[PDB]
């Protein structure tokens, strides 16, 4: 019987839980996480091994988001390579009104498909007619 | 003639740009001839004027509607790329169950995913660039 050291009310019981996690505007569920969990406030306590498993999953998610994400500077370059204004690019690639104005200030993440479309248009500027 | 809606304004012949929203998409219908109330902007359009107006309304509805892709088309492109739905979901985005719902018609892909799938339908080899 260990009492939760955060809420000081509930009991910590060992279990396996799926943990929601958001990083750089991307969401995931960290699946099958072993640890002690407070029945009252859901605070988690992980031993050395459990923490290793958890952090490997967290860091694999971060690595993948970072590799997929593109710099504001890349977005501008691809847009300028296509001689598009921010408004035309938002319309052509997607994202809504002011999408590219926000993307280029580093103030928003494009949808994964917008990023990928940008990556393809970077290498294939001739495809612009197919998407406009 | 007095305006038949507000009863406190004269209807005058003119031309106006009329904003119009359809399925949450906004446009301005340009150069619409009609009688317009000076007070409340109620419009009265004769047959000929209504046909012109409705032809713009309908051309805008049709282009908005046509942005949607047949779920059949989504299956066509996916099979074509030798991808499962789990993989497509991971590649194109939308979430864990994305592509299963698209092909049942229970969800619409993001506009960029549609564009990316239309591009890939014509040039399926480019997947290897963004996989
Ligand atoms: Zn607690
Ligand atoms: Zn009136």
Domain CATH code at residue A94? 1.10.260.40
Binding residue positions of B for Zn(2+): 3, 6, 37, 40
Q: What is the phi-psi region of residue A24: left when phi exceeds 0, alpha when psi lies from -120 to 50, beta otherwise?
A: left
Last residue of a domain, one of A67, A91, A110: A67
Q: Where are the alpha helices (DSSP H) in chain B?
A: 47-66, 71-80, 85-92, 98-104, 111-122, 127-130
Q: Are residues A4 and A59 in the same domain?
A: yes
Q: For residue B38, give the ligand nearest its CA.
A: 2
Indicate whether A79 and A61 sit together in one domain: no
CA A17–ligand 1 middle distance (angstroms)? 15
Phi, psi of A15 (to 5 degrees): -170, -175
Are residue A4 and residue A47 in the same domain, yes or no? yes
Number of domains in chain A: 2
Structural domain for B123, as ranges: 67-131
Question: Do residues B89 and B97 touch, judged by C-beta distance below 8 A?
Answer: yes
- DSSP bridge pairs for A11: A3
B61: left (phi over 0), alpha (psi -120 to 50) or beta: alpha
Q: Is A113 on the interface with B (CB under 8 A)?
A: yes
Q: Which residues pair with A102 in a beta bridge?
A: none
Separation of alpha carbons B41 and B46, rounded Å: 16
Positive or negative CA dihedral for A25, A31, A37, A41? Answer: positive
Q: Return the residue matching tokens 């910590």.
A: A12
Alpha-carbon gap, residue A32 to A18, rounded angstroms? 5
Cβ atoms of residues A12 and A35 within 8 Å: no
What distance in Å separates the CA atoms of residue B73 and residue B86, rounded to the nearest whole number?
18
Q: B93: nearest CA in chain A?
A: A112
The 8 Å CB, 24+ separation contacts for A32-36 are A33/A57, A36/A2, A36/A12
Order of all β-strands in the sheet with B43-44: B11-22, B25-37, B43-44
Same domain, A59 and A85: no
Rounded CA-CA distance A33/A36 in Å is 10
* Partner residue facing B115 (CB), from A112, A124, A131: A131
| CATH of residue B37 | 3.10.20.860
Q: Is A61 on the interface with B (CB under 8 A)?
A: no
A74 is in an annotated binding site: no
Resolution of the experimental structure, in angstroms = 2.2
Q: Quick one: A35 and A52 in the same domain?
A: yes
| Count of all residues that appear for chain A in the document | 132
Number of Cβ within a 10 Å radius of residue B79: 10
Ligand nearest to the CA of B8: 2
Report how far residue A32's alpha carbon sits from residue B59's, in angstroms, rounded to the nearest whole number.
52
CB A114 within 8 A of CB B112: yes
Check if B111 contacts A (Cβ < 8 Å): yes
Q: How far is B66 from chain A (nearest CA, A)?
A: 14
Strand blocks (E) in chain A: 12-23, 26-38, 44-45
**CA separation for the pair A99, A91 (Å, rounded):** 9
Query: What kind of experiment solved this structure?
Result: X-ray
B95 shares its domain with B50 = no
């Amino acid at each position: 019987h260990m009492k939760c050291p955060v809420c000081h009310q509930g009991e910590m019981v060992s279990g396996i839980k799926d943990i929601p996690y958001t990083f750089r505007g991307r969401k995931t569920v960290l699946k099958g996480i072993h640890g002690l969990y407070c029945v009252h406030c859901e605070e988690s306590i992980m031993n050395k091994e459990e923490s290793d498993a958890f952090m490997a999953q967290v860091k694999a998610f971060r690595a993948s988001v970072n590799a997929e994400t593109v710099a504001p500077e890349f977005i501008v370059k691809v847009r300028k390579k296509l001689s598009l204004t921010q408004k035309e690019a938002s319309e052509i690639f997607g994202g809504g009104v002011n999408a590219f104005s926000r993307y280029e200030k580093g103030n928003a993440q494009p949808h994964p498909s917008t990023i990928k479309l940008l990556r393809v248009l970077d290498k294939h500027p001739e495809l612009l007619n197919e998407i406009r």
